[PDB]
Write a protein that binds this ligand. Structure first.
Ligand SMILES: CCn1cnc2ccccc21
Length: 182
């Protein structure tokens, strides 16, 4: 509907796949080469379904900060025959607050979904499902089951992936450029 939705659509149309694990279907952001991200609660194993195709997982790393606190991001390298467009130049270098973000989801349940979530706070610590978690972004939108893995964007920046909610607020794990240095 406007330039925020334009950037979000451009990311969804080229840099997402539908990932399926034993814990559900997730929006999955491809970052570069065969490297993608998903929430750690997806419990990625040795095999994952990508757009309903059986795909070997070459590597999976559940990230934690240097305090050994959960970040809720898992970086997955996929045994796929095709590379993602490299979007690492759209990743923030530092922790930050943002204005006027969009949360975008693409699954069997929620195809072509875009949500203007407004202001995003650097919330920091969250007890996420009983797990102490750091680097959490917060937005005041009542997000629902099915939106985990959704991409959080502003114009020109890919800032996080949706990992949970409390019925009134939604929470995303930050994406930082330093997670994807090769
Ligand atoms: C409570 C707002 N909300 C959140 N996720 C949705 C999906 C469909 C319709 C409404 C939705």
């Amino acid at each position: 509907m406007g330039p925020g939705f334009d950037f979000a659509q451009a990311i969804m149309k080229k840099n997402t796949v539908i990932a399926r694990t034993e814990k559900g279907e997730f929006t999955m952001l491809g970052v570069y080469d065969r490297v993608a991200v998903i929430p750690t609660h997806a419990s990625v194993g040795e095999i994952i379904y990508i757009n309903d195709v059986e795909t070997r997982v070459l590597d999976a790393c559940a990230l934690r900060d240097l305090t050994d606190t959960n970040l809720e991001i898992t970086i997955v390298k996929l045994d796929r025959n095709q590379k993602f467009r490299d979007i690492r130049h759209f990743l923030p270098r530092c922790e930050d607050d943002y204005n006027d973000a969009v949360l975008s989801v693409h699954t069997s349940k929620f195809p072509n979904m875009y949500i203007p979530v407004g202001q995003v706070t650097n919330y920091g610590f969250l007890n996420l499902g009983g797990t102490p978690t750091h680097r959490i972004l917060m937005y005041n939108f009542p997000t629902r089951a099915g939106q985990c893995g959704g991409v959080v964007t502003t114009t020109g920046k890919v800032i996080g992936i949706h990992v949970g909610g409390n019925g009134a607020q939604g929470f995303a794990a930050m994406l930082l450029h330093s997670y994807f240095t090769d």
